[PDB]
Design a protein around this motif. Structure first.
Motif, PDB file in Angstrom:
ATOM      1  N   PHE A   5       0.763  -1.252  -0.025  1.00 30.75           N
ATOM      2  CA  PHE A   5       0.055   0.011   0.047  1.00 30.75           C
ATOM      3  C   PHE A   5       0.849   1.262  -0.256  1.00 30.75           C
ATOM      4  O   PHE A   5       1.998   1.396   0.700  1.00 30.75           O
ATOM      5  CB  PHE A   5      -0.872   0.127   1.447  1.00 30.75           C
ATOM      6  CG  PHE A   5      -1.988  -0.951   1.162  1.00 30.75           C
ATOM      7  CD1 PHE A   5      -3.047  -1.003   0.382  1.00 30.75           C
ATOM      8  CD2 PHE A   5      -1.846  -2.286   1.807  1.00 30.75           C
ATOM      9  CE1 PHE A   5      -4.195  -1.985   0.380  1.00 30.75           C
ATOM     10  CE2 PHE A   5      -2.906  -3.252   1.959  1.00 30.75           C
ATOM     11  CZ  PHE A   5      -4.039  -3.409   1.352  1.00 30.75           C
ATOM     12  N   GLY A  38       0.220   5.400   0.558  1.00 28.01           N
ATOM     13  CA  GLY A  38      -0.801   6.523   0.704  1.00 28.01           C
ATOM     14  C   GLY A  38      -0.175   7.902   0.139  1.00 28.01           C
ATOM     15  O   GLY A  38       1.259   8.164   0.290  1.00 28.01           O
ATOM     16  N   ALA A  47       9.895   9.933   2.959  1.00 24.88           N
ATOM     17  CA  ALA A  47       9.996   9.668   4.519  1.00 24.88           C
ATOM     18  C   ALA A  47      11.340   9.823   5.074  1.00 24.88           C
ATOM     19  O   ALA A  47      11.752   8.801   5.447  1.00 24.88           O
ATOM     20  CB  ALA A  47       9.250   8.547   5.226  1.00 24.88           C
ATOM     21  N   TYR A  83       8.039   4.637  -0.191  1.00 26.77           N
ATOM     22  CA  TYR A  83       7.830   3.720   0.901  1.00 26.77           C
ATOM     23  C   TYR A  83       6.327   3.087   0.771  1.00 26.77           C
ATOM     24  O   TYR A  83       5.549   3.634   0.319  1.00 26.77           O
ATOM     25  CB  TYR A  83       7.538   4.567   2.230  1.00 26.77           C
ATOM     26  CG  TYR A  83       8.759   5.089   2.888  1.00 26.77           C
ATOM     27  CD1 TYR A  83       9.876   5.745   2.460  1.00 26.77           C
ATOM     28  CD2 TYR A  83       9.101   4.310   4.362  1.00 26.77           C
ATOM     29  CE1 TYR A  83      10.962   6.044   2.947  1.00 26.77           C
ATOM     30  CE2 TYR A  83      10.299   4.744   4.902  1.00 26.77           C
ATOM     31  CZ  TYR A  83      11.381   5.392   4.417  1.00 26.77           C
ATOM     32  OH  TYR A  83      12.648   5.857   4.970  1.00 26.77           O
ATOM     33  N   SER A  92      -0.477   3.452   5.486  1.00 28.05           N
ATOM     34  CA  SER A  92      -0.792   4.219   4.593  1.00 28.05           C
ATOM     35  C   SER A  92      -1.960   5.215   4.492  1.00 28.05           C
ATOM     36  O   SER A  92      -2.212   6.230   4.097  1.00 28.05           O
ATOM     37  CB  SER A  92      -0.942   3.531   3.171  1.00 28.05           C
ATOM     38  OG  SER A  92       0.397   2.720   3.017  1.00 28.05           O
ATOM     39  N   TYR A 138       0.479  10.491   5.410  1.00 24.95           N
ATOM     40  CA  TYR A 138       0.607  10.152   4.159  1.00 24.95           C
ATOM     41  C   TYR A 138      -0.542  10.253   3.278  1.00 24.95           C
ATOM     42  O   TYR A 138      -0.682  10.751   2.026  1.00 24.95           O
ATOM     43  CB  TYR A 138       1.096   8.658   4.223  1.00 24.95           C
ATOM     44  CG  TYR A 138       2.097   8.354   5.216  1.00 24.95           C
ATOM     45  CD1 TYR A 138       3.358   9.121   5.271  1.00 24.95           C
ATOM     46  CD2 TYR A 138       1.892   7.507   6.253  1.00 24.95           C
ATOM     47  CE1 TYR A 138       4.159   8.883   6.241  1.00 24.95           C
ATOM     48  CE2 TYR A 138       2.734   7.330   7.137  1.00 24.95           C
ATOM     49  CZ  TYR A 138       4.087   8.136   7.222  1.00 24.95           C
ATOM     50  OH  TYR A 138       5.094   7.966   8.298  1.00 24.95           O
ATOM     51  N   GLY A 174      17.255  -1.795   6.268  1.00 26.52           N
ATOM     52  CA  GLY A 174      17.581  -0.319   5.716  1.00 26.52           C
ATOM     53  C   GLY A 174      17.564   0.758   6.974  1.00 26.52           C
ATOM     54  O   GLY A 174      17.291   0.302   8.276  1.00 26.52           O
ATOM     55  N   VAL A 196      15.037  -2.256   0.856  1.00 32.22           N
ATOM     56  CA  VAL A 196      15.393  -2.325   1.995  1.00 32.22           C
ATOM     57  C   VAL A 196      13.882  -2.448   2.785  1.00 32.22           C
ATOM     58  O   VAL A 196      12.950  -2.046   2.274  1.00 32.22           O
ATOM     59  CB  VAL A 196      16.024  -1.464   2.644  1.00 32.22           C
ATOM     60  CG1 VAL A 196      17.525  -1.124   1.704  1.00 32.22           C
ATOM     61  CG2 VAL A 196      15.375   0.020   2.773  1.00 32.22           C
ATOM     62  N   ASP A 205      12.243  -2.912   7.201  1.00 39.10           N
ATOM     63  CA  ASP A 205      12.434  -2.612   8.694  1.00 39.10           C
ATOM     64  C   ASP A 205      12.936  -3.832   9.432  1.00 39.10           C
ATOM     65  O   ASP A 205      13.629  -3.953  10.408  1.00 39.10           O
ATOM     66  CB  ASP A 205      11.160  -1.880   9.194  1.00 39.10           C
ATOM     67  CG  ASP A 205       9.823  -2.877   9.134  1.00 39.10           C
ATOM     68  OD1 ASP A 205       9.824  -3.723   7.986  1.00 39.10           O
ATOM     69  OD2 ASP A 205       9.327  -3.143  10.218  1.00 39.10           O
TER      70      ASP A 205
END
Ligand SMILES: NC(=O)c1ccc(Oc2cccc(C(=O)N3CCC(c4ccc(F)cc4)CC3)c2)cc1
Ligand SMILES: NC(=O)c1ccc(Oc2cccc(C(=O)N3CCC(c4ccc(F)cc4)CC3)c2)cc1
Lengths: 182, 185
Positions: free
Chosen positions: A69, A71, A91, A95, A103, A108, A132, A154, A156
């Motif tokens: 998704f 946003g 960001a 993303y 989102s 966003y 990342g 990348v 989280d």
């Protein structure tokens, strides 16, 4: 290429409508969906499937593609519909969220003057990804011997990802656009 | 009807491009045009040409159609592309839509509001102005032409019946958003 496009509104009886609204309502049931539309941009699509073909021949058994998704504000919609998410305010990549509720955050998917929020359901070539940090403008190299090969995206968290960051052209196709309100 | 649409960007060499950029720069030369696009919505188009066909059958020699400007914000663009200016009453009010003869009224930041990237949006609109009279920014429908026959109302209202600078339309499928001009300061 001109990358012209058409916008096809899905009927609530459509199987695609129920597929998309279903994934969105996993985490965004409290919102009211006003419409779901499919973005039909043949040039952008061909470019995307071309880079998918190349990645599919490079990552072996990897399921390179995910549906995620994104946003955005109302202003960006005509620009995403035409150009995808190429050469970007995120960001210095783009993303994407595993779940819609990231989102759907007003930061966003900003509500426009009429209170409408916009979240795309995007076909993204996540490929082979690593962890990342929000300060990378290119993905890190897979091998320090071979700085040739960078990762595709990348994330989280490499084993239970909630977000991915994409950096290259034609890495994402904005297949469906969801318009909703609070 | 679904009223789906396609968005076709005109090339700077197109005859349509410089025709449209020519009409716009008459009063907005100081802006930079980023792109000009044609909105191709067959359902909205057919509905519009039907209402033009009926009006053309009612107003005799009147040149019912004019090409006018309408500034809107980026949020409205997907909605005008699909729905035209049909049915808050969030115009320059009031149950109607405002169109400018000259683009500079529409290029005012109040109507073509700059979006987060600084881009402004103005349509070049086919409008069935038809037979118009003077208006008073308080109208929910146009006044009736004849008090004998409150049936037949005017098609639009204007600020000045002989040198109009703006028109207000009130009915469905009276306007078709043919071209979208995206520009910045
Ligand atoms: N437009 C969207 O729909 C959208 C979709 C997903 C999306 O992810 C989020 C969600 C919530 C917060 C943040 C956020 O700013 N950081 C997250 C935590 C840190 C971080 C994690 C991973 C990294 F690779 C880099 C940095 C710092 C930055 C990002 C944002 C927008
Ligand atoms: N969206 C647009 O691009 C747009 C295009 C054109 C447009 O016209 C303008 C421009 C400047 C001021 C006004 C304005 O508020 N009134 C004009 C003067 C008076 C009036 C005269 C005749 C009438 F029939 C009604 C009212 C009072 C109200 C309206 C606005 C937006």
């Amino acid at each position: 290429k001109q990358q012209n496009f058409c916008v096809v509104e899905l009927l609530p009886s459509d199987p695609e409508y129920n597929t998309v609204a279903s994934k969105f309502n996993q985490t965004c049931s409290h919102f009211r969906i006003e419409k779901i539309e499919r973005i039909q941009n043949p040039d952008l699509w061909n470019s995307y499937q071309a880079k998918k073909k190349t990645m599919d021949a490079k990552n072996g058994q990897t399921m390179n593609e995910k549906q995620l998704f994104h946003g955005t504000d109302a202003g960006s919609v005509p620009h995403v519909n035409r150009n995808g998410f190429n050469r970007s305010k995120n960001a210095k990549g783009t993303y994407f969220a595993v779940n819609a509720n990231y989102s759907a955050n007003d930061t966003y998917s900003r509500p426009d003057a009429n209170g409408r929020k916009h979240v795309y359901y995007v076909r993204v070539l996540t490929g082979i990804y690593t962890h990342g940090n929000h300060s990378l403008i290119v993905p890190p190299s897979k091998n320090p011997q071979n700085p040739t090969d960078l990762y595709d995206t990348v994330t989280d968290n490499v084993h239970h990802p909630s977000l991915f960051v994409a950096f290259y052209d034609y890495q994402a196709y904005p297949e469906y656009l969801i318009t909703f309100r609070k």
